[PDB]
Enzyme design. Structure first.
Site, short mmCIF file in Angstrom:
data_model
loop_
_atom_site.label_atom_id
_atom_site.label_comp_id
_atom_site.label_asym_id
_atom_site.label_seq_id
_atom_site.Cartn_x
_atom_site.Cartn_y
_atom_site.Cartn_z
N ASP A 86 5.29 0.97 -9.80
CA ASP A 86 4.98 2.32 -9.31
C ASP A 86 5.27 3.47 -10.27
OD1 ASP A 86 4.13 4.49 -7.83
OD2 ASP A 86 5.30 4.02 -6.05
N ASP B 155 10.72 7.83 -9.94
CA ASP B 155 10.77 7.24 -8.59
C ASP B 155 11.50 5.89 -8.62
OD1 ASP B 155 10.21 7.45 -5.83
OD2 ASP B 155 8.19 6.65 -6.02
N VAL C 295 3.61 -9.66 -9.48
CA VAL C 295 5.03 -9.99 -9.26
C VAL C 295 5.13 -10.66 -7.89
CG1 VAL C 295 5.66 -8.05 -10.78
CG2 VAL C 295 5.74 -7.75 -8.29
N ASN D 168 10.88 -0.02 -5.66
CA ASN D 168 10.13 -0.14 -6.91
C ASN D 168 10.75 -1.10 -7.93
OD1 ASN D 168 8.13 1.54 -5.97
ND2 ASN D 168 9.10 3.41 -6.72
N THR E 89 7.53 36.90 -29.90
CA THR E 89 8.43 37.76 -29.14
C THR E 89 8.76 37.24 -27.73
OG1 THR E 89 8.87 40.07 -28.45
CG2 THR E 89 6.59 39.29 -28.25
N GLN F 22 -0.04 5.93 0.29
CA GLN F 22 -0.99 6.86 0.93
C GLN F 22 -2.43 6.70 0.39
OE1 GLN F 22 -0.92 9.07 3.48
NE2 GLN F 22 -2.78 10.26 3.06
N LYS G 143 13.90 3.45 -7.38
CA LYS G 143 14.54 3.16 -6.11
C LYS G 143 14.31 1.66 -5.82
CE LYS G 143 10.42 4.59 -3.62
NZ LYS G 143 9.85 5.82 -3.02
N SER H 110 0.81 -1.20 0.00
CA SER H 110 0.00 0.00 0.00
C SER H 110 0.85 1.26 0.00
CB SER H 110 -0.91 0.01 1.23
OG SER H 110 -0.13 -0.08 2.40
N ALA I 270 -3.26 4.20 -2.18
CA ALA I 270 -3.26 2.98 -2.97
C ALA I 270 -3.14 1.75 -2.11
CB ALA I 270 -2.14 3.01 -4.03
N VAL J 200 -2.76 -2.53 -2.85
CA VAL J 200 -2.55 -3.58 -3.83
C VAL J 200 -2.92 -4.93 -3.20
CG1 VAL J 200 -0.88 -4.78 -5.31
CG2 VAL J 200 -0.74 -2.25 -5.01
C1 LIG Z 1 2.45 0.20 -3.25
C2 LIG Z 1 2.82 0.19 -4.73
C3 LIG Z 1 1.72 0.93 -5.48
C4 LIG Z 1 4.19 0.81 -4.93
C5 LIG Z 1 2.85 -1.29 -5.19
N1 LIG Z 1 3.16 -2.31 -4.40
C6 LIG Z 1 3.07 -3.43 -5.10
C7 LIG Z 1 3.27 -4.77 -4.78
C8 LIG Z 1 3.69 -5.11 -3.48
C9 LIG Z 1 3.91 -6.44 -3.14
C10 LIG Z 1 3.73 -7.43 -4.10
F1 LIG Z 1 3.94 -8.74 -3.79
C11 LIG Z 1 3.32 -7.10 -5.39
C12 LIG Z 1 3.09 -5.76 -5.76
C13 LIG Z 1 2.69 -5.40 -7.07
C14 LIG Z 1 2.46 -6.34 -8.11
O1 LIG Z 1 2.58 -7.57 -8.01
N2 LIG Z 1 2.08 -5.86 -9.37
C15 LIG Z 1 1.88 -4.50 -9.64
C16 LIG Z 1 2.09 -3.59 -8.62
C17 LIG Z 1 2.48 -4.03 -7.35
C18 LIG Z 1 2.68 -3.07 -6.38
N3 LIG Z 1 2.55 -1.73 -6.40
CL LIG Z 2 2.29 0.01 -9.07
#
Ligand SMILES: CC(C)(C)c1nc2c3ccc(F)cc3c3c(=O)[nH]ccc3c2[nH]1
Ligand SMILES: [Cl-]
Ligand SMILES: CC(C)(C)c1nc2c3ccc(F)cc3c3c(=O)[nH]ccc3c2[nH]1
Ligand SMILES: [Cl-]
Lengths: 265, 264
Positions: free
Chosen positions: A157, A135, A92, A140, A167, A19, A137, A17, A21, A23
């Site tokens: 992310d 971003d 992922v 991400n 002129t 602020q 890092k 998560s 979002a 997931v």
């Molecule tokens: C919080 C943020 C928006 C940066 C984000 N966290 C994840 C994430 C965190 C743990 C995990 F096992 C998978 C994900 C994940 C994912 O599997 N796919 C797309 C975004 C995303 C994600 N996107």
């Molecule tokens: Cl994401």
């Protein structure tokens, strides 16, 4: 009357998560295939509901829908209801790259450069389409599956990613001197990522946040011999060509891929 | 559904024609055919302009009444202005300082409205300052051309403020977005030319002009400003300041003794 995401995907464990979002792991009811569902909370000034603006959501979505590369997450569907925009994204499962690297035994520079090369490929793809991530890092930089001989990098992310690019008698000095932010910022971030990849140390990190920001702005870092004594001179040169103050002096992504250090990999 | 007429004006990627449904102005904006192409205006830039026009309602700013689109052009139906450019009207007229401030006040009122909505025009110049009708006793100013107008950035647009700054580039750490202050500089230049007929930073070439602007290289040559008041000079000096943060804001400009004075 809009299509409801829950009618198409069954929602599972929370994966991460931010602020505005959340997931969750989800399963496509039609096929059983697993995805990640990213719920983005919409701002609603009327209801005093804080969240992401329509423009910011559109920015991220419009970038995601353009992206098709093995080192970047893919977007599969979009839902919207009153309170959220829900993105169905590639799942992922291998966690953060640097967590996986921490678990390894005898991590070598050559092994590290293999992961860096994947990051360069994903960024090269982005930049070829004029997309700056902004971003980049470790948090991400994920892995698709960590239980394979050669795990695959997946960038996530795109929350602050942007598409890049009469002129003069009446224009202000700040307009005359303006230089927009661009792709070069990603290349700096790659320099920092490479430094921590090869050392386990953050180059600009200070004892306090103000010190970190001061260090970055002064480009104040060292190749401490404790960590860098047996890092190759080619790797140090790669890093030095990215960690420079003037964005226009930095190596671009195509140059980065043609650097002798990367060409050797 | 609109019968087109004569061509009123043009810009790099826009042409404006008079039209009748009630007479209006028809702005034809040429769309980029390919996102990579340098020819035409991008979808995002057109929507940005339209969204700005849609939210603005003020007597000194043109209104948007309809939109049309096809594969090549986006056509905006806008309020028709028939009094020409302000400076042409003043040229055919001498002009008192008090008369000059009467028109400038209307410009300031329009800009105050924009700035209240966090919109910078970014291309304030004489050619974008029109008169609705020049054959009346108190002609109304109408600002045109919102082709580069923007809502001013948040400040965390290019930065994730909820995470570590460890990987952020120095140009992002030291990022200063363009803001409302740029318009206030432009107002200082417009005011200088309004009172003198001379352009303060104009050089022999565009690059010379840009260099002069950057150095804030101007003066009040007595050849042009012998009949100009110290208050008018002070107003201009407070606007043509290099540091945007030391420049008069729109509310300060309106409170300035040169403007605040009561006139016939
Ligand atoms: C919080 C943020 C928006 C940066 C984000 N966290 C994840 C994430 C965190 C743990 C995990 F096992 C998978 C994900 C994940 C994912 O599997 N796919 C797309 C975004 C995303 C994600 N996107
Ligand atoms: Cl994401
Ligand atoms: C070229 C530009 C887009 C700035 C523009 N020129 C005009 C214009 C020129 C002469 C004239 F008599 C009227 C206009 C006019 C107008 O009457 N309404 C809206 C825009 C507009 C305009 N908009
Ligand atoms: Cl216009």
């Amino acid at each position: 009357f809009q299509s409801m995401v829950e009618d198409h995907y069954e929602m599972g464990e929370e994966l991460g998560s931010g602020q505005f979002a959340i997931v969750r792991k989800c399963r496509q009811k039609g096929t059983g295939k697993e995805y990640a569902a990213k719920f983005i909370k919409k701002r609603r000034l009327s209801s005093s509901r804080r969240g992401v603006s329509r423009e910011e959501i559109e920015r991220e979505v419009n970038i995601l829908r353009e992206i098709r590369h093995p080192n970047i997450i893919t977007l599969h569907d979009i839902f919207e209801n009153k309170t959220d925009v829900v993105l169905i994204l590639e799942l992922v499962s291998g966690g953060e790259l640097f967590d996986f690297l921490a678990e390894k035994e005898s991590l070598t520079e050559d092994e590290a450069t293999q992961f860096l090369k994947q990051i360069l490929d994903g960024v090269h793809y982005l930049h070829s389409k004029r997309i700056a991530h902004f971003d980049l890092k470790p948090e991400n930089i994920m892995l698709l599956d960590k239980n394979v001989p050669n795990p695959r990098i997946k960038l996530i992310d795109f929350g602050i990613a942007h598409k890049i690019e009469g002129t003069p008698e009446f224009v202000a000095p700040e307009i005359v001197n303006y230089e927009p932010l661009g792709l070069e910022a990603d290349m700096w971030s790659i320099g920092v990522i490479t430094y921590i990849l090869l050392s386990g140390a953050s180059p600009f990190l200070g004892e306090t946040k103000q010190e970190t920001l001061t260090n970055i702005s002064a480009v104040n870092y060292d190749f401490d011999e404790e960590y860098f004594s047996n890092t190759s001179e080619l790797a140090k040169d790669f890093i030095r060509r990215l960690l420079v103050k003037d964005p226009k002096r930095r190596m671009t992504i195509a140059q980065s891929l043609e650097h002798s250090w990367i060409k050797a990999i």
